[model samples]
Target: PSCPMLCTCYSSPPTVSCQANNFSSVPLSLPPSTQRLFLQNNLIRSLRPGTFGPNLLTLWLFSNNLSTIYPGTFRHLQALEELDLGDNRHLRSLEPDTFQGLERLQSLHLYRCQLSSLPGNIFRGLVSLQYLYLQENSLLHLQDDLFADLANLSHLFLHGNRLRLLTEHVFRGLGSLDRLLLHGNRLQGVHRAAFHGLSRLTILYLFNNSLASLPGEALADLPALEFLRLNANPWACDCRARPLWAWFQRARVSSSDVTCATPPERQGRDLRTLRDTDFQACPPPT
Candidate 1:
């Protein structure tokens, strides 16, 4: 079949490569049997509702000028497993219902999009979603019920954002969540119930942040949690941080890189490097 005038579509046995085209909209006449679709490095800006074809499973629209995706843009992609939309500089936000029909979607990559915040119900219909990547965005806030309906979600990546606080209900309805990545953010506080329903969570990455004190109950519910990354946080070595220091001594959890970053009295002191007795808990109130 002939390619569209403004957009070019080419297909091999199992893959399709279409690049450098100035497609103002989704191409209409691509082969329905194509499994992989590449529409990267183009001038395509918007993805209208119901843009994807039924049989297309993997779609790559990275490095484009797209800023918005209307609802129903992924309506026909029932079998789509992987969708990559990284490197879009102008992309700011995604419609809450943009992925309303992608029931079978497993992996979604949306890195470096400059997104400020996500709608609370953005991932409402993604029940079967497993791996969700939103790294390197400009996200500053995550609502309480942000992940309310994602039951089967397992791996969630939120590294390299601008988050400051993680409330109790931020991870709502994520009982099956396994791996959570929150490295390279600006977290200053963590609620005790922030990891409320993550029963099966195994690996949690919390490195490279600005946490001043660790709440005593912060790591209370993570019985199955194995790996915790808290290497580069500016942990204040004061009474406010004694609870975490005491917990780290008795929890038997494997953490060696924890260190202090404040209070000139204890400068250059590593939490792991100091004996448990060196740090004392706050005195009782008068």
Candidate 2:
């Protein structure tokens, strides 16, 4: 087909712009030369397999009423790199292999969906993915090894969720990760090995959470860590939180913005300025 009615087609990059359409279904027989496709602000309820071209590189389907996507829909877009499916509140189920064949895929956006959990290895084939945004969801837990194959991933945003804990090995194998945002959650605990292999990580946001204390060792292996935000958390100022206090100083990392919320005497006190005696679990009066 040349070009579907109500859609404009360009030849340079073979672009197709079909925004603001009340499409309950995608128009059939898109041109095979299409490289970039835009169908945002529409009413696409589902996608049947083979709905796109083999040469498609960018697929922007955000802000639509999408809820179901047939499996293997993008299997032909092996060269595809970026895919955006954000703001589809009804999309909560994703079958395995739905994203299995995109070897060169780099960025994937699934933010603002009502997803509470994902099938492990759902991202197994995206070895080149660098950016993954899953923020503002209802996720309460992160399955270990969920991102085991995202070796080159750099930025992962999971803020504004319902996550209450970060179990051990939850973020393993992300060797090249640069920034990790876990803020604005119900986060209360972080296992010592939650960040096992993130050596290149520099910025980690953990602010505005429900954390009372963090195991200092939980920040291990992040030798490149330069900025760590732990503000707005209900931090405990007892021996349990002393290790992180000491690490903040020893590492010369900025922590003045992080304050204490417990220990009535130290409430509202900044961990950066607290003296060693402030955390002394020293000899109790005999």
Candidate 2 backbone collisions, by pair: none
Clashing residue pairs in candidate 1 are 50-72
How many pairs of residues collide in each model? 1, 0
TM-score, each model? 0.88, 0.96
Candidate 1's C-alpha runs over 4 A off are 2-14, 22-24, 252-256, 273-281, 284-286
Error of 2 at 253 (Å): 2.9
Top model number, TM-score: 2
* Per-residue accuracy of model 1 over 194-252 as CA lDDT, tens digit each: 98778888888889999877776667677677788888988888776666766676676
Which residue runs does candidate 2 get wrong by more than 4 Å? 282-286
lDDT of each: 0.81, 0.85
> What C-alpha lDDT does candidate 2 achieve relative to the native structure?
0.85
